[PDB]
Write a protein that binds this ligand. Structure first.
Ligand SMILES: Cc1c2ccocc-2oc1=O
Ligand code: NA
Ligand code: NA
Ligand code: NA
Length: 267
């Protein structure tokens, strides 16, 4: 059941639905410090993607999940099946891009996109700074197929930032361990070999572009890159936070920023 893989969950109520997408290695629980502050005003729809929960027996890695375009298509199917009208889409990490891709096809279904820790491409070119040289990609991949357990122990603190002991690193490690290792590797490869830069000018719905100032995976210049290239309205806010999952690791800072961008129009 594709429904089992997505694990769509709804909470809250209101005239507007907020759809929350998550990044690689985590799941919808990454939004645990945001949801309490939305449910009074919004219906909230959460879903799992990018291989999350694939240690569940009922999980099957459908063919559509071979590409980020397939995830974008699947998001559109979710919006259809849950009768979504003009959602506020909040995408962490690559789900910002699957949301953006989807919004080019059904802009009528998106009131806005709020991007958190988004990047259209991690690998550098001669002319584009994504934050990774080839050596960096190969070193981050590390033991992902040799020894999944070892890989997680190194990957999780690097991505989350701060220090290995933090609850956020523990949480990210927990969700990584709810991924089947083969799926983690294939999705990791999909992501690092995807290049979404060409889509940006086709995006027309308003984009609120939020990131940590100190994110190992997303140089500060990436927020500006997106801002300069999208085809509709946009705004940038770079937070004084570290790490790729600041909604989990620095909620005291990140949650009020997210709420302001959810609740208020540009501009
Ligand atoms: C694969 C991958 C990542 C690796 C490191 O940092 C953030 C990432 O987000 C992703 O989707
Ligand atoms: Na697949
Ligand atoms: Na379906
Ligand atoms: Na608004």
């Amino acid at each position: 059941r594709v429904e089992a893989a997505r694990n769509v969950h709804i909470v809250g109520s209101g005239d507007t639905t907020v759809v929350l997408g998550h990044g690689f290695g985590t799941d919808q629980s990454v939004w645990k410090h945001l949801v309490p502050y939305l449910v009074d005003s919004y219906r909230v729809l959460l879903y799992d993607n990018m291989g999350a929960g694939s240690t569940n027996p009922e999980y099957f890695h459908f063919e559509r999940y071979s590409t980020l375009q397939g995830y974008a298509h699947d998001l559109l199917v979710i919006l259809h099946e849950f009768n979504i009208r003009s959602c506020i889409f909040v995408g962490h990490s690559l789900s910002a891009m699957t949301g953006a891709i989807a919004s080019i096809i059904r802009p009528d279904l998106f009131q806005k996109i709020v991007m958190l820790s988004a990047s259209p491409r991690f690998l550098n070119t001669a002319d584009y700074l994504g934050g990774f040289e080839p050596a960096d990609v190969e070193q981050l991949a590390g033991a992902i197929e040799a020894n999944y357990k070892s890989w997680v122990s190194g990957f999780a603190p690097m991505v989350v930032g701060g220090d290995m002991d933090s609850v956020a690193v523990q949480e990210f490690s927990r969700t990584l361990f709810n991924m089947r290792p083969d799926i983690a590797r294939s999705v990791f490869r999909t992501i690092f070999t995807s290049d979404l830069r060409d889509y940006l000018g086709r995006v027309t719905v308003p984009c609120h572009i939020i990131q940590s100032s100190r994110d190992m995976a997303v140089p500060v210049s990436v927020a500006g890159y997106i801002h300069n290239r999208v085809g509709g309205r946009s705004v940038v806010e770079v937070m004084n936070t570290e790490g790729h999952l600041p909604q989990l690791s620095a909620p005291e800072v990140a949650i009020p920023v997210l709420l302001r961008h959810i609740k208020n129009d540009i501009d």
